[PDB]
Design a protein around this ligand. Structure first.
Ligand code: ADP
Ligand code: ADP
Ligand code: TRP
Ligand code: TRP
Ligand code: NA
Ligand code: NA
Lengths: 319, 320
């Protein structure tokens, strides 16, 4: 069962991304050969500022490598280096009823929040179907809002298979509901669109600003504090084993220590936890030639698989 | 010396109406125009996914146009799918294409109006066509009224792109070719495949004999003078005859003593001799695939160099 994950290059990774998905992805690499790609063609649907898009791609590559993606075990590349996905995209469009795409909620949702009503935004799910189907993907790890896109991919595969014979694997979404939802600085679900994030690859000065923004109770410094509902505790939990959690909890219930101290402590836990990844990340961005090499290594492996599939597709479509 | 670009998407068998109505003009434009012509095989995928047939149609189309006069040395002639850059450009242009432009395309509207369901491919092809045009800095796109809106769409995309990124694309213009003398079919009506009134270029002599035999004549006795002004044999023969050739035929008509059966026999001789070289070349290109490939490969290298230069500029703007 091939697992394939496309990764958005847009924006800074935050601890919610890390504990909610990335860590699981990294720890799954010994279980099977996993496929992961930075989806920079898809990033063009929300911006055409090339200088920014290009840096976003480099940074995303460096972030995921530094967080534990192993290019030896896995197949990790930049979407735009394997150009076969473009041709399959066009071929798959001949099998995609407009009806299927007009219904898609993701286009409506993105338009409603201000994105441009463009052909690229509308066509987003077809290109993603090409990503999935080109590599005979069985399982697509996604957030809940990308489930329908995977479903669209499958519907397309069914239409192709019905016409051409069983040439595509039928993909299914995998969402993990087991995972804790990481609260942001305001108490709501941590997300970039809420600007309530604690970012992984920021300077200590920047991280301090973020942690300081965390909303808390009005409870006096002297009085016992409720750990169960405290955002700081809730985030600290991510960095603490059983004893450390209890030790912090005990500081909460004693009084004489304030949330300002708890924030100081959280800064320490966060800086220490991602210390190694941050240095690796800055190290990769400092010498971009090594990053290009890692990405090229990954592309070579993905391209071989893509080229094998395209040869079969070429037979069916007459290329 | 403005660049003229035409995508070619033939269907069924080519007939003398396609030839004298469009192809000859295109062939003759080569010496004094900068002509780019491609077999639009990506676009043919919108109405068929029968790969076996699609592959053959492409080979036949390339062989046919080469046989009838496309000069690979003078012009740039290639198979669309050999220059893959066009797919990448198509995706980039989609980001600059508002939905309303494509929703208003008649090719999509007409389909939905007659009840049918449309594929994303049908909806999206004006964008791919815009990529075809813009990739090569086309100034002039020779098209049928059919296609005017598509060129306008390509023009709107280019303007949007240029507004965002600078001088990236040349603004293309449609050229409707006017107003070419219609070719009469075997039945008196305009020759067309829909009517089954055609005379085909690359058929067997048996099939040509059959088509010519079907030409509608008048009931005039064998020996009597024939009226060349109303005769479809004569009207069709004119295409293959110079002014004094027609005159010699017309004398034969006015003289009498020769029947329409004999004029049809004559018409066969004219058509077979006129296309003899093209047919032999056509068949040769299909029987020895390597020769056609060499020619298509050459065309593709000339077009690809231009496409690569455009993409280098595009890459700087989109971050690739
Ligand atoms: N606050 C969060 N808590 C748990 N998981 C999260 C959180 N934010 C993102 N994820 C995970 O990361 C993925 C979605 O990332 P994404 O939506 O692009 O980032 P963002 O939160 O900024 O909007 C999903 O797998 C989701 O499970
Ligand atoms: N009878 C004709 N006389 C003049 N030109 C023609 C004729 N039939 C076709 N053409 C030319 O050939 C081109 C393609 O026509 P096409 O759609 O292949 O014909 P049909 O109606 O047989 O399908 C047109 O752009 C037109 O200019
Ligand atoms: N749409 C995905 C990114 C993506 C692109 N192609 C994919 C293929 C498979 C899985 C995910 C993707 C996201 O928003 O995160
Ligand atoms: N759409 C054209 C063929 C075509 C594809 N791309 C083009 C670019 C320019 C001119 C024509 C084309 C037709 O139906 O005949
Ligand atoms: Na978000
Ligand atoms: Na017709």
């Amino acid at each position: 069962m091939r697992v394939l994950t496309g990764l958005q290059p847009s924006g800074d990774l935050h601890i919610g991304n890390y504990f909610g998905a990335i860590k699981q992805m990294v720890d799954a690499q010994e279980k099977s050969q996993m496929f992961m790609f930075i989806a920079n063609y898809h990033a063009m649907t929300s911006s055409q500022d090339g200088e920014k898009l290009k840096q976003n791609s480099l940074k995303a590559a460096a972030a995921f490598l530094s967080l534990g993606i192993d290019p030896q075990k896995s197949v990790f590349w930049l979407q735009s280096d394997v150009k076969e996905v473009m041709e399959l995209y066009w071929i798959l469009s001949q099998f995609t009823p407009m009806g299927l795409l007009e219904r898609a909620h993701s286009y409506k949702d993105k338009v409603a929040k201000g994105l441009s009503a463009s052909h690229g935004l509308f066509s987003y799910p077809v290109l993603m179907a090409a990503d999935i189907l080109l590599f005979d993907t069985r399982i697509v790890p996604v957030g809940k809002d990308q489930i329908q896109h995977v479903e669209i991919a499958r519907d397309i595969a069914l239409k192709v298979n019905n016409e051409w014979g069983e040439i595509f694997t039928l993909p299914e979404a995998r969402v993990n509901e087991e995972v804790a939802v990481v609260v942001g600085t305001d108490g709501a679900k941590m997300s970039k669109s809420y600007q309530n994030t604690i970012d992984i690859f920021s300077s200590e000065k920047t991280l301090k600003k973020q942690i300081s923004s965390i909303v808390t109770d009005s409870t006096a410094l002297e009085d016992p504090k409720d750990h169960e509902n405290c955002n700081i505790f809730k985030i600290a939990k991510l960095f603490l084993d059983e004893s450390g959690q209890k030790e912090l909890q005990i500081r909460y219930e004693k009084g004489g220590e304030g949330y300002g101290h708890f924030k100081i402590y959280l800064n320490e836990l966060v800086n220490a936890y991602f210390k190694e990844a941050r240095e690796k990340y800055n190290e990769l961005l400092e010498k971009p030639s090594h990053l290009k090499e890692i990405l090229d290594f990954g592309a070579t492996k993905a391209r071989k698989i893509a080229q094998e599939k395209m040869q079969k597709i070429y037979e069916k479509i007459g290329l």
